[PDB]
Amino acid sequence: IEWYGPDRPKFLGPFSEGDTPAYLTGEFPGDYGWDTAGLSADPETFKRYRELELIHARWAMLGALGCITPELLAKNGIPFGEAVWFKAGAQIFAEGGLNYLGNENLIHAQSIIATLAFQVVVMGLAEAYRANGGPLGEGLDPLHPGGAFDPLGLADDPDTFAELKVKEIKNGRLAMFSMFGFFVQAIVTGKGPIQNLDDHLANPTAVNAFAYATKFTPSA
Amino acid sequence: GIEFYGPNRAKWLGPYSENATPAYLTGEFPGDYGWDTAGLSADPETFKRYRELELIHARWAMLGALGCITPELLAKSGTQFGEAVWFKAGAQIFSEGGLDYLGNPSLVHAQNIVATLAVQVILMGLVEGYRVNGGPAGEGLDPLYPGESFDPLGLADDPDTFAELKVKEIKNGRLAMFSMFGFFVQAIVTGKGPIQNLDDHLSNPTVNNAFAFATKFTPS
Amino acid sequence: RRTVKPASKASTPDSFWYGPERPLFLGAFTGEPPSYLTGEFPGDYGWDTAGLSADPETFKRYRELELIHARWAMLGALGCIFPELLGSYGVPFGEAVWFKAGAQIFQEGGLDYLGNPNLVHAQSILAILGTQVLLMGAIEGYRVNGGPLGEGLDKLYPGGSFDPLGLADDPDTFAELKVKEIKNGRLAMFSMFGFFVQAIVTGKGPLQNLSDHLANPGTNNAFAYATKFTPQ
Amino acid sequence: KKAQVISPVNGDPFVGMLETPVTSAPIVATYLSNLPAYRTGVAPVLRGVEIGLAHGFLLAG
Amino acid sequence: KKTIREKAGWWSNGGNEKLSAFYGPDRGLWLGPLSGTTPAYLTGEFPGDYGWDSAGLSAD
Amino acid sequence: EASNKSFPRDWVKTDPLVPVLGFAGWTIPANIGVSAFGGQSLFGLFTQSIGENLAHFPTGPALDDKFWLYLITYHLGLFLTITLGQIGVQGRKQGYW
Ligand code: CHL
Ligand code: CLA
Ligand code: CLA
Ligand code: CLA
Ligand SMILES: CC1=C[C@H](O)CC(C)(C)[C@H]1/C=C/C(C)=C/C=C/C(C)=C/C=C/C=C(C)/C=C/C=C(C)/C=C/C1=C(C)C[C@H](O)CC1(C)C
Ligand SMILES: CC1=C[C@H](O)CC(C)(C)[C@H]1/C=C/C(C)=C/C=C/C(C)=C/C=C/C=C(C)/C=C/C=C(C)/C=C/C1=C(C)C[C@H](O)CC1(C)C
Ligand SMILES: CC1=C[C@H](O)CC(C)(C)[C@H]1/C=C/C(C)=C/C=C/C(C)=C/C=C/C=C(C)/C=C/C=C(C)/C=C/C1=C(C)C[C@H](O)CC1(C)C
Ligand SMILES: CC1=C[C@H](O)CC(C)(C)[C@H]1/C=C/C(C)=C/C=C/C(C)=C/C=C/C=C(C)/C=C/C=C(C)/C=C/C1=C(C)C[C@H](O)CC1(C)C
Numbered sequence: 001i002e003w004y005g006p007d008r009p010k011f012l013g014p015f016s017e018g019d020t021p022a023y024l025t026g027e028f029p030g031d032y033g034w035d036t037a038g039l040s041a042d043p044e045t046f047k048r049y050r051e052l053e054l055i056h057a058r059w060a061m062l063g064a065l066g067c068i069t070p071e072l073l074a075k076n077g078i079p080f081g082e083a084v085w086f087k088a089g090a091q092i093f094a095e096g097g098l099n100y101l102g103n104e105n106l107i108h109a110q111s112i113i114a115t116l117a118f119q120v121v122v123m124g125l126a127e128a129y130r131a132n133g134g135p136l137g138e139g140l141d142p143l144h145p146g147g148a149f150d151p152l153g154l155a156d157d158p159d160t161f162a163e164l165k166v167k168e169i170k171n172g173r174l175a176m177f178s179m180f181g182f183f184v185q186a187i188v189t190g191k192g193p194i195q196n197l198d199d200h201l202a203n204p205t206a207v208n209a210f211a212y213a214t215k216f217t218p219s220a
Numbered sequence: 221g222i223e224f225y226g227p228n229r230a231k232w233l234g235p236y237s238e239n240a241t242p243a244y245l246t247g248e249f250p251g252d253y254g255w256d257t258a259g260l261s262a263d264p265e266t267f268k269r270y271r272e273l274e275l276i277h278a279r280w281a282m283l284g285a286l287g288c289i290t291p292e293l294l295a296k297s298g299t300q301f302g303e304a305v306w307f308k309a310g311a312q313i314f315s316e317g318g319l320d321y322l323g324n325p326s327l328v329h330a331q332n333i334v335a336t337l338a339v340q341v342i343l344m345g346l347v348e349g350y351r352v353n354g355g356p357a358g359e360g361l362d363p364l365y366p367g368e369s370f371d372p373l374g375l376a377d378d379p380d381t382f383a384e385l386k387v388k389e390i391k392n393g394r395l396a397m398f399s400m401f402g403f404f405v406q407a408i409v410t411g412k413g414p415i416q417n418l419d420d421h422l423s424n425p426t427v428n429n430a431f432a433f434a435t436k437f438t439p440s
Numbered sequence: 441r442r443t444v445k446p447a448s449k450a451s452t453p454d455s456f457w458y459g460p461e462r463p464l465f466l467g468a469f470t471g472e473p474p475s476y477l478t479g480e481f482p483g484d485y486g487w488d489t490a491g492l493s494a495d496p497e498t499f500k501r502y503r504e505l506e507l508i509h510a511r512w513a514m515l516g517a518l519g520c521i522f523p524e525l526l527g528s529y530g531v532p533f534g535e536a537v538w539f540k541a542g543a544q545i546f547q548e549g550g551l552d553y554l555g556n557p558n559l560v561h562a563q564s565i566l567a568i569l570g571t572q573v574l575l576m577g578a579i580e581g582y583r584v585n586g587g588p589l590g591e592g593l594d595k596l597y598p599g600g601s602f603d604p605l606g607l608a609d610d611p612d613t614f615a616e617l618k619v620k621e622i623k624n625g626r627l628a629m630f631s632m633f634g635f636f637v638q639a640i641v642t643g644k645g646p647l648q649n650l651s652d653h654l655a656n657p658g659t660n661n662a663f664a665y666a667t668k669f670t671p672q
Numbered sequence: 673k674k675a676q677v678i679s680p681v682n683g684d685p686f687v688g689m690l691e692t693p694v695t696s697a698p699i700v701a702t703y704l705s706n707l708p709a710y711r712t713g714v715a716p717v718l719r720g721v722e723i724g725l726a727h728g729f730l731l732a733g
Numbered sequence: 734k735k736t737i738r739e740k741a742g743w744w745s746n747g748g749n750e751k752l753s754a755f756y757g758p759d760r761g762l763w764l765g766p767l768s769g770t771t772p773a774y775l776t777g778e779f780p781g782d783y784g785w786d787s788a789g790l791s792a793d
Numbered sequence: 794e795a796s797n798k799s800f801p802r803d804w805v806k807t808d809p810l811v812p813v814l815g816f817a818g819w820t821i822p823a824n825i826g827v828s829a830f831g832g833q834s835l836f837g838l839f840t841q842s843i844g845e846n847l848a849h850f851p852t853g854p855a856l857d858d859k860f861w862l863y864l865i866t867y868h869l870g871l872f873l874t875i876t877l878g879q880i881g882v883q884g885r886k887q888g889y890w
Contacts, residue, residue, distance in 0.1 A: 673887060673888040673889055674887050674888065675801075675806060675883075675887060676794060676796065676797055677797075677800075677801075677804045678794075678797070679794060679797035679798065679799070679800045679801075680794065680797070682799075683797075683798035683799060685794070691800040692800075693804055695800075696800040697804065698802050
């Protein structure tokens with residue numbers, strides 16, 4: 001396995017020698033040669049799309065872990081006023097507000113407006129620093145800055161850097177796919193991901209997505 | 221010390237925007253704050269087509285914003301408006317007396333939506349084709365700022381006034397496009413008019429905000 | 441009867457759909473098309489008002505997408521119209537309407553082809569899906585990268601076994617049939633968008649929608665479903 | 673007031689047939705040329721077989 | 734490359750490429766596209782040669 | 794005839810817009826409902842009869858069906874409109890006025 005160069009692993013495997021565009025050189029992590037739509041023919045649009053892909057990847061990984069953790073901890077025994085992720089936002093309108101791990105004296109948030117104000121102010125600060133630098137950086141890479149974002153120092157060797165880049169972008173594509181699944185099957189099922197897995201393990205041939213297939217038929 | 225052009229123009233992230241700008245977003249065109257994070261306008265020709273789309277969407281959204289604000293104001297004031305709210309102002313054709321313009325039964329008194337749509341499609345196709353390639357009001361002018369009959373008042377014969385009014389146009393238009401997206405989403409979420417939404421927000425700002433309608437689209 | 445003389449004198453007197461003097465999508469109101477839509481490719485009416493195919497290679501990939509979507513949409517239009525059309529004649533399908541035909545696999549006697557029990561008689565959903573994804577991946581990778589029915593053939597118009605009757609031997613007839621294909625396919629794509637939309641807003645089969653329209657066109661048009669998506 | 677249709681036969685105004693749509697329309701000329709009577713290179717026995725099949729089938733009705 | 738009626742199999746006495754599927758090097762074989770190394774002695778000169786001598790009994 | 798040496802193949806100077814425009818110039822007025830038809834139209838009643846006679850496909854229309862009146866009148870107007878459109882178009886392009 002290479003992950004780079006001309007004979008890298010590709011998205012159709014053995015079927016992939018004639019489809020790859022000429023601009024998808026095996027230079028960037030996760031380059032399986034999948035640009036059937038030609039949306040990255042321009043190197044600059046390609047760079048912007050690579051940045052979008054990696055940021056969506058990292059945010060989707062954090063979000064996948066954030067949707068899996070509270071439900072696991074919920075059956076693990078921990079009280080969670082609303083453990084399911086797609087109503088974990090409605091805890092602010094409960095009587096005791098959003099208590100972090102069920103403890104009344106951990107956070108105890110009662111206002112969503114101030115939470116959102118907090119969040120917007122420092123998300124804007126952090127994302128602007130991500131754009132053009134700031135207190136942790138000012139001329140680093142827009143995608144792999146390092147320095148203060150490597151307190152452990154995993155990627156000082158270029159080969160380790162490259163393989164961890166591929167690992168990053170692929171765990172991130174996996175998490176993005178799983179987050180799209182979270183979205184669509186929360187809308188279709190209305191239950192959490194962990195409960196969906198529990199129901200699929202209870203009856204795999206009956207409780208699958210096709211049991212909810214006639215749900216969105218107009219019928220008028 | 222404002223410029224709205226050149227390298228030190230006003231930009232979308234303010235002070236954190238010096239490394240946030242592509243090399244192709246020269247301070248040449250109105251409204252160029254340097255916001256092309258997605259790289260969708262790397263090609264100058266795609267950039268020109270997108271500028272035309274932006275300006276036409278801007279003007280149409282300004283006309284539409286004024287057209288959604290005016291009838292409700294006139295409705296609250298004292299005027300009779302069979303259906304003052306904008307997102308059912310189209311269903312007046314199916315009422316008993318049809319779509320009366322200002323509540324007068326003998327101003328327009330439209331009864332058939334198919335003929336309305338026919339005359340609209342005819343006139344609109346004619347005028348949009350004239351907008352594309354010219355016609356009775358300008359054989360060879362700018363696709364965006366034709367002038368010479370669309371300036372009966374003559375505001376923009378000086379290049380500096382032309383430039384500043386260009387920026388004013390595109391920015392009032394971006395404001396109106398943002399407000400029209402808001403109209404759409406919060407009509408779907410709330411089901412009430414924009415003016416009534418402002419009335420309810422002024423009634424109780426901490427209670428009746430968008431978060432009061434947050435658990436509305438949960439699958440369950 | 442006279443013998444038609446060769447095309448040395450007549451290289452392009454029939455090129456009506458190609459070249460600079462070609463029909464455009466706004467007729468005489470188009471002006472002049474973009475500098476990259478020069479009329480070498482079929483169906484080029486000069487419609488790139490968004491500039492999405494300003495790059496030549498993105499334009500190639502979009503041509504591929506458009507033609508494949510066009511063929512799939514023609515097959516889809518015919519496949520949504522045919523079962524309902526024969527269900528209006530007395531052929532007993534389970535659900536002849538297309539946006540209910542998928543659930544036929546949840547019937548009592550399973551999904552019967554032409555409503556005939558001794559025909560396909562599919563009883564499971566995921567064997568259908570597994571067989572389908574297997575074979576579709578095989579043949580879509582073949583479409584991508586060679587295969588049993590052609591290796592060094594064209595990407596979009598491979599021919600060979602896909603032109604068995606040889607309707608593309610004449611290059612003039614080939615250039616005309618390409619325009620016919622892309623136009624019928626854009627019509628079928630528009631009509632499949634219509635199928636989707638006027639299934640969502642209506643919930644009846646498209647041929648039943650046409651029956652309702654021709655029952656009373658002034659009443660049974662899409663404006664009769666204009667107030668269905670009102671907020672609350 | 674251009675574009676007259678009816679022409680002399682092969683441009684000869686003195687032979688006397690007056691090429692005409694019913695005579696020399698390309699659809700008509702094609703159909704009549706494809707009939708076994710006018711397949712001058714094909715063996716007459718086979719053209720006769722085709723003509724006879726057609727006529728025997730039709731005149732039984 | 735051909736016309737419709739030659740594809741449809743007309744015109745008997747056009748047979749020299751029709752022996753190619755039953756004689757010669759690139760003929761039809763016993764496992765079809767999954768039989769690569771035919772025995773060298775099965776040159777394709779005799780009728781019914783599909784390259785099947787798994788047991789090597791006809792090596793002489 | 795000093796011209797016309799070879800019977801030009803384009804003897805009908807075809808304009809594909811001509812049939813569409815004659816069809817639309819006839820059938821759209823033929824879709825206007827009038828008092829004499831009981832509020833219905835000529836094209837509407839013609840298609841209604843087409844449907845009523847396709848309901849028994851083998852059995853053709855009767856002598857007393859009224860499908861023949863609609864048929865003959867509709868096609869009188871339609872053929873007249875199409876031929877006069879062809880004539881007008883090819884006279885406009887050519888001389889003739
Ligand atoms: C350093 C300070 C500073 C910051 C942080 C920003 C930030 C921004 N400016 Mg900017 N500006 C700043 C200084 C200045 N701006 C401008 C002039 C402009 C203009 C003209 C424009 C901007 C715009 C923007 C936005 C572009 C990025 C974006 O689209 O957000 C993307 C990120 C979000 C939208 C996050 C939303 C936050 C919130 C948490 C969302 C809530 C989540 C929902 C609940 C989830 C949704 C639920 C679903 C399921 C239905 C961004 C918010 C643009 C804009 O308004 O776009 C919106 C714009 O047109 N600025 C000037 C004048 C020179 C500045 C001077 O200092
Ligand atoms: C790898 C990620 C991942 C995983 C582990 C799961 C796992 C599951 N999903 Mg989710 N899903 C995913 C991605 C994923 N999905 C994505 C990307 C989508 C959007 C298309 C969905 C949309 C979705 C819906 C709408 C529903 C589920 C449901 C389910 C459960 C039943 C299985 C089923 O119906 O399959 C459905 C799977 C898909 C629609 C697409 C996923 C594609 C997979 C990952 C590739 C094929 C792998 C497969 C084993 C091999 C082929 C099998 C063959 C029969 C074709 C199960 C817990 C159902 C549920 O809640 O049941 C309890 C349900 O209603 N999923
Ligand atoms: C400048 C344009 C503009 C203006 C004046 C308003 C004004 C209003 N909106 Mg609308 N809205 C807008 C744009 C706008 N909106 C856009 C672009 C969207 C799409 C995201 C929406 C979507 C929306 C929904 C779904 C709802 C409203 C509602 C409301 C009302 C209550 C305020 C609220 O809940 O905020 C919600 C505001 C947003 C979701 C986004 C707008 C972003 C603003 C303009 C920027 C932030 C300015 C703010 C003062 C500073 C930060 C505050 C801090 C707490 C974070 C209020 C009358 C609610 C209503 O009807 O109550 C009566 C309601 O249900 N709006
Ligand atoms: C060429 C493709 C095609 C064809 C033949 C039809 C035909 C039909 N549609 Mg469908 N439709 C189409 C495309 C098509 N549609 C597309 C692309 C959309 C998505 C925008 C829709 C969305 C749609 C809805 C939502 C509904 C229909 C309905 C109907 C029926 C009544 C006509 C109507 O309400 O017009 C509505 C037409 C549109 C919304 C857009 C299509 C525009 C056409 C194709 C182009 C203009 C041609 C037309 C003759 C001229 C109109 C201008 C006139 C005012 C002067 C009729 C059988 C209605 C129905 O089922 O009634 C029983 C219905 O409820 N259609
Ligand atoms: C490649 C290619 C190629 C060709 O050429 C073309 C095409 C086809 C176009 C392409 C494709 C593409 C694609 C597929 C894409 C996808 C995407 C996605 C899926 C994303 C996600 C994405 C995703 C994401 C971000 C995610 C995120 C997440 C998050 C934040 C989370 C959050 C949260 C949580 C924790 C939970 C809680 O309770 C709350 C909240 C708040 C909710
Ligand atoms: C810049 C950038 C950058 C990066 O790079 C990328 C990205 C991000 C992509 C980008 C962004 C973008 C955006 C944001 C966009 C937006 C848009 C909109 C909002 C529009 C609107 C738009 C809007 C519009 C047109 C509007 C219009 C309106 C109108 C007509 C109106 C009408 C009307 C009215 C009066 C009312 C009545 O009752 C009726 C009706 C009929 C209804
Ligand atoms: C040109 C241009 C220009 C400028 O520059 C810009 C713009 C404007 C953007 C552009 C435009 C564009 C457009 C319009 C597009 C559209 C598309 C479509 C509509 C598609 C469809 C598409 C469509 C399609 C594929 C379709 C397909 C179909 C199918 C498969 C079917 C299937 C089936 C059937 C049979 C029935 C059964 O029972 C079931 C199923 C399974 C369902
Ligand atoms: C190729 C190969 C290859 C590899 O390398 C190796 C191997 C594997 C060894 C090989 C194979 C082989 C094989 C498979 C063989 C087989 C054989 C057979 C089956 C025979 C039969 C064989 C068979 C035979 C002769 C048969 C015969 C018969 C006969 C005479 C008959 C007679 C008769 C009859 C009429 C009836 C009467 O009532 C009686 C009888 C008296 C009974």
